[PDB]
Amino acid sequence: LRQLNLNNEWTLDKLRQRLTKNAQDKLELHLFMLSGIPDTVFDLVELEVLKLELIPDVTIPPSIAQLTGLKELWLYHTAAKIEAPALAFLRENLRALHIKFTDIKEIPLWIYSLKTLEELHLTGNLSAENNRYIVIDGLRELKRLKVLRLKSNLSKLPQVVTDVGVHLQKLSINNEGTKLIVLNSLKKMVNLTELELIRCDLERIPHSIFSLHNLQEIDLKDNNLKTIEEIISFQHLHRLTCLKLWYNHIAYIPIQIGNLTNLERLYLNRNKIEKIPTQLFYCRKLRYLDLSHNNLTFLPADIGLLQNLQNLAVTANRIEALPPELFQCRKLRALHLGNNVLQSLPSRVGELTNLTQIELRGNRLECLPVELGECPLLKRSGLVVEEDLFSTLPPEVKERLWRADKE
Amino acid sequence: LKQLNLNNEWTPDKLRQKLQTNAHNRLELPLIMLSGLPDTVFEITELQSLKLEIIKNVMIPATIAQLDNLQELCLHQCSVKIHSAALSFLKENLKVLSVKFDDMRELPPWMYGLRNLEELYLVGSLSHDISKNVTLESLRDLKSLKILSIKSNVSKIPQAVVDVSSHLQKMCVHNDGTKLVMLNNLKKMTNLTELELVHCDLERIPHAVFSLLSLQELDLKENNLKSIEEIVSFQHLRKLTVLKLWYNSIAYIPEHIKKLTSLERLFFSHNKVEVLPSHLFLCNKIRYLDLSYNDIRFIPPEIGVLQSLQYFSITCNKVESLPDELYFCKKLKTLKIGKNSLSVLSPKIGNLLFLSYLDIKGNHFEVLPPELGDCRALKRAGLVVEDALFETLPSDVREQMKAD
């Protein structure tokens, strides 16, 4: 009666409205406190991400074959009971699977039998008695796995994951402040491309990070590294173009980073960098540069070297005057300059054309120059500033900006 | 049941929809006329600011320890309760507070157990027995407080401010017709830097302001300053660069302005000034001078002394004569002379290289000269004028001006 009533209550029409899109721009429906999966949910054929979150012990029927587009399932505290035809359909169709659990029994055993699975995310502590890195021994059956996120607070990387790493291209570890025992055991995953150690609290860089040659993006988020000293060995990483050293106690940048000329997305924000030096600008390839929430003394002139810079973010840092060399570059697009001690914005911002948004709220900004109206791509949504400071502009250029905004 | 309803009513996706930004560039959740505070709100951990408007009978659990990213709290006309872990965490984390006390009890008594608090927005109202508010004089427990804005009918400055003068820096008070008295409590300000008093009905500038030796700026907004004779001690405010005495009644300006030359910002808009003296423009460090919507008869030529001026507003004056020495001052970035009694725009105006803004709106002009092309930073927007004055440029000058 409950399931039949749920099919009537949750109708296909209301669920068509329930359909939303995620950051990956994928049609998805969030099933929160549902008794089971309504048949009206499975009738949907345009679904991309089905969110079985907190659905108590739901049995998956074969009608999941109707979900032809189904590629993403996020079983959040939802034990999935499945049978052979639905198993076959998931093995032949399903490719990404983010299992969040609080118990070993919550993890279903059929998730290790899927052929086409390539993205697998685990959340929940995995250290247990007589089950440490044994339940995932079925990861060897899964040969298509490329993304393996383990928000499992694990103290060491499992060896089965190391054998998987021959075909794994992405390994993100979240330990929530627990030091992971590296022992240079990640040298097996030569295919690893994005090692994102999230909240690993490493405080050092092991040699395995720069021993593998295949990492393009290495984000040591909240790894608490005091001194960034292993960056000389990263020049052998020709693939490395995104070295996001944010959320650390880096108090000074040694000049040696001038070795790494291939870097583009250097996100060095939310740190206590006393100053980014001139030699830091020796990487002319830097296209995206984030220094937000930092202790900079000022912003040097060698920023004129970074001709490829698009978004320079120094929000809530200590910069008193904006150098004209900042405006010498023309490729700036997103200027996160808010909450600063900028005395005034120079009129040379009129040179900037690619600037589509600029954060100017707060600061010590005396007035906004009229040259901001010279920027074509900039609009009201792009130009975020206080109402009075915006009103300091002449009426007709404000009308021009309004007309370019609304249309 | 109330809390269960709150969690059931507001899904986290609805809170994602509610997510917005505020006046301080923080992630704000506007919660309006709610029955309580849901735990789903605290499930969001990326949140930087909380806005609770008339949500009364509300007790803050330990669950706010989930969201570490908070920096601002807007507790508006709501009587809020507290729990021990909430006290500890908001002592450790919360820094910016903005409360509205429509009722005195709608101000909760626990704001003052904190220490990390830095900004405070005390909007609302107050009664006759001002000194009895022990809620004010507990900010001795606050060590990091730096911003205090009290929009209330406060007649007497409390001894609270006297105690917290060591670390306080900014004042913003809107009395709205209420006379402010007992100015010794503002005398014993020591480390304060900003003072914005609005409608405090201060007839004269007290010796309190001159007792301040590190005041960056002063505002005497909506204060009936008929005469300015106590400026002699204003020299003690060496940090004073801003004197925003606008919408005021200063009938004439004396020689005492020579006491302080560090003055930079000078707003006398809508003042009662009749003739400027020879003694304003001696202080060459002045860059930001306002006389908007005044009734000055004419501008004497001693304006030539103000070279480091970058803003000279005298808009809606009765000034019929602009001598050419303000055109001689080329560092004058802004220069607003709108709706005066002037006759002709100066032909030798292209000499002012750094003239960013020339508001001369509504002036009785005849024909614009051709030397606006020599002006590097003057636009049609900058030179706001009636359109029959805009239509006067030569055709080649139109070709050079439409392309700037």
Side-chain angles (χ1 to χ4, degrees), chain A residues 18 20 32 293 338-339 361-362 366-367 370 392 394-397, chain B residues 12-13 22-25 48 264-265 288 310 356-357 379 381-382:
Chain A
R18 190 61 177 89
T20 54
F32 225 176
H293 283 187
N339 301 353
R361 180 164 225 158
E366 212 154 83
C367 271
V370 200
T392 64
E396 202 277 335
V397 47
Chain B
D13 186 26
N22 46 25
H24 309 60
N25 288 351
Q48 209 164 12
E264 170 188 355
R265 274 157 154 227
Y288 214 167
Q310 77 105 53
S356 60
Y357 188 11
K379 304 325 287 194

Side-chain angles (χ1 to χ4, degrees), chain A residues 247-289:
Chain A
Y247 290 104
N248 297 319
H249 329 74
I250 324 173
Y252 78 105
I253 312 169
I255 70 178
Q256 313 293 50
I257 165 169
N259 299 352
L260 266 167
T261 61
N262 222 337
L263 263 300
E264 304 159 1
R265 315 178 48 90
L266 166 58
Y267 281 27
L268 177 63
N269 49 297
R270 195 71 41 101
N271 299 335
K272 298 152 297 311
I273 288 306
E274 52 181 3
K275 61 179 180 181
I276 61 171
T278 69
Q279 307 81 327
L280 184 101
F281 308 104
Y282 283 0
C283 192
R284 293 61 61 81
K285 185 47 66 203
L286 288 172
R287 190 178 176 184
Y288 309 97
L289 214 67

Side-chain angles (χ1 to χ4, degrees), chain A residues 104 107-109 111-113 120 122 126 130-143 145 148 156 158-164 167:
Chain A
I104 312 170
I107 328 170
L109 291 203
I111 84 161
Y112 314 85
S113 72
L120 188 172
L122 292 203
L126 212 62
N130 297 346
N131 291 303
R132 191 183 189 184
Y133 316 141
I134 308 300
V135 200
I136 47 180
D137 286 353
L139 283 183
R140 290 305 305 271
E141 318 303 313
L142 181 43
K143 236 53 188 177
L145 204 58
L148 201 43
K156 74 153 181 83
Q159 201 267 349
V160 52
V161 167
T162 74
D163 324 285
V164 167
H167 43 273

Side-chain angles (χ1 to χ4, degrees), chain A residues 201-351:
Chain A
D201 263 8
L202 281 195
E203 296 121 341
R204 286 164 297 182
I205 307 175
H207 288 83
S208 45
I209 308 202
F210 39 91
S211 180
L212 306 170
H213 330 77
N214 273 333
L215 316 82
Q216 307 54 29
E217 312 166 21
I218 304 165
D219 301 358
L220 304 185
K221 155 43 181 63
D222 268 328
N223 277 22
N224 294 359
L225 320 167
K226 255 285 181 318
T227 48
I228 197 50
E229 303 301 318
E230 285 77 22
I231 72 190
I232 174 181
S233 299
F234 271 137
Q235 65 179 319
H236 326 63
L237 256 59
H238 314 288
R239 298 187 160 82
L240 176 53
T241 51
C242 184
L243 209 49
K244 292 191 178 186
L245 281 297
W246 52 4
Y247 290 104
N248 297 319
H249 329 74
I250 324 173
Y252 78 105
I253 312 169
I255 70 178
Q256 313 293 50
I257 165 169
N259 299 352
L260 266 167
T261 61
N262 222 337
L263 263 300
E264 304 159 1
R265 315 178 48 90
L266 166 58
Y267 281 27
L268 177 63
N269 49 297
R270 195 71 41 101
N271 299 335
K272 298 152 297 311
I273 288 306
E274 52 181 3
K275 61 179 180 181
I276 61 171
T278 69
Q279 307 81 327
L280 184 101
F281 308 104
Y282 283 0
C283 192
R284 293 61 61 81
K285 185 47 66 203
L286 288 172
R287 190 178 176 184
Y288 309 97
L289 214 67
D290 189 2
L291 290 310
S292 287
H293 283 187
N294 277 257
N295 306 351
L296 311 144
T297 314
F298 65 98
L299 186 169
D302 281 43
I303 194 72
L305 249 66
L306 316 186
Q307 204 32 271
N308 305 341
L309 178 58
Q310 284 207 134
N311 51 353
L312 152 62
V314 285
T315 289
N317 299 354
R318 275 292 76 68
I319 307 181
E320 288 276 345
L322 277 179
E325 293 88 30
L326 152 71
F327 307 101
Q328 269 284 5
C329 185
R330 298 300 197 273
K331 184 171 310 154
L332 295 73
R333 187 169 312 288
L335 257 194
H336 292 299
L337 301 203
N339 301 353
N340 206 332
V341 288
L342 310 195
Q343 301 140 347
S344 181
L345 151 63
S347 64
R348 280 303 86 189
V349 64
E351 290 169 337

